[PDB]
Amino acid sequence: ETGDQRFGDLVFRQLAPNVWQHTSYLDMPGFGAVASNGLIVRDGGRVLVVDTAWTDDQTAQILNWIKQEINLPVALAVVTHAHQDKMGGMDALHAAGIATYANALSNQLAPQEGMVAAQHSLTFAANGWVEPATAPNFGPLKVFYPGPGHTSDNITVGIDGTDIAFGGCLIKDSKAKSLGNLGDADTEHYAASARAFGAAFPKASMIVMSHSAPDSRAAITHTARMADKLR
């Protein structure tokens, strides 16, 4: 995939001058190697991370890659729900003294989901927007809770100053034939939540997501239409 950089067993792709996608892989029984994507954002003299890799050792390699390619300190990480692809590498962040943030519900669920909770909890208004007091110095990361979907706690992140919005595991690409792992999903509200993400980030033309390469806005509508079939 031209423009991908391999760094150990992780892949990094630059999406914009100050934004990269990090990709890590799990061997899955019945699936083979499964990719999970998150984001790295350079914001002045600091770096902000969205989502861990699947494991601590892989997440440590994200930090090493950041040191080598960007060489600015990581100020914080946001993790977008309590599943292993997103929070499996929390100990690597905490070992490195990085402040971590998740939906309060993600932190509340983390023990039952076998995840380490983030240090800090985000809360949200009734319209889905993060309460700013709970997202200190998030810079360009604009966090939106679109409602229950892939999980009840899934959050999304727009990257202000860019055309990029991150749908996490709520959004699948427009070529998807399924909505992936629905084990913890809210099948009643998933469609409205997918639609709410699209309405929250109207400027976004590149939709990044956990288990698909970046796609256009059609990923959002296609996802919402697949979810409509669950109701």
Ligand X SMILES: O=C(O)[C@H](CCCn1c(-c2ccccc2)n[nH]c1=S)N(Cc1ccccn1)Cc1ccccn1
| Residues making contact with ligand X (CB under 6 A) | 28, 34, 83-85, 150, 169, 176, 178, 180-181, 210-212
Nearest in space to 176 (alpha carbons), one of 230, 146, 221: 221
| Shortest Å distance, C-beta 97 to ligand X | 26
> Using the rule CB under 8 A, is 126 a contact of a copy of itself?
yes
Distance (Å, rounded) from C-alpha 12 to C-alpha 22?
5
Q: Which residues of 42-68 are buried (b: 16+ CB within 10 A; e: fewer)?
A: bbeeebbbbbbbbbbebbbbbbebbee
Residue number with CB closer to ligand X (94 or 211): 211
Which are the residues after which the chain is interrupted (C to N > 2.5 Å)? none
DSSP letter (8 states) at residue 131: P
Residue 101: in which H helix or E strand, if any? strand 99-103
> Using the rule CB under 5 A, is 210 a contact of Zn ion?
yes
Q: Is 189 annotated as a binding residue?
A: no
Instruction: Say if residues 87 and 110 touch (Cβ distance below 8 Å).
Output: yes
> Using the rule CB under 5 A, is 57 a contact of Ca ion?
no
Considering only residues 154 through 213, tell me which ones interact with a copy of itself, judged by CB under 8 A.
Answer: 183-184, 186, 188-189, 192
Q: Is 69 annotated as a binding residue?
A: no
- Span interacting with Zn ion, options 7-15, 61-69, 128-136, 203-211, rule CB under 5 A: 203-211
Site residues, Ca ion (CB under 5 A): 56, 91, 184
Provide the annotated binding site for Ca(2+): 56, 91, 113, 184, 188
Q: Which residues bind Zn ion (CB under 5 A)?
A: 83, 85, 169, 210
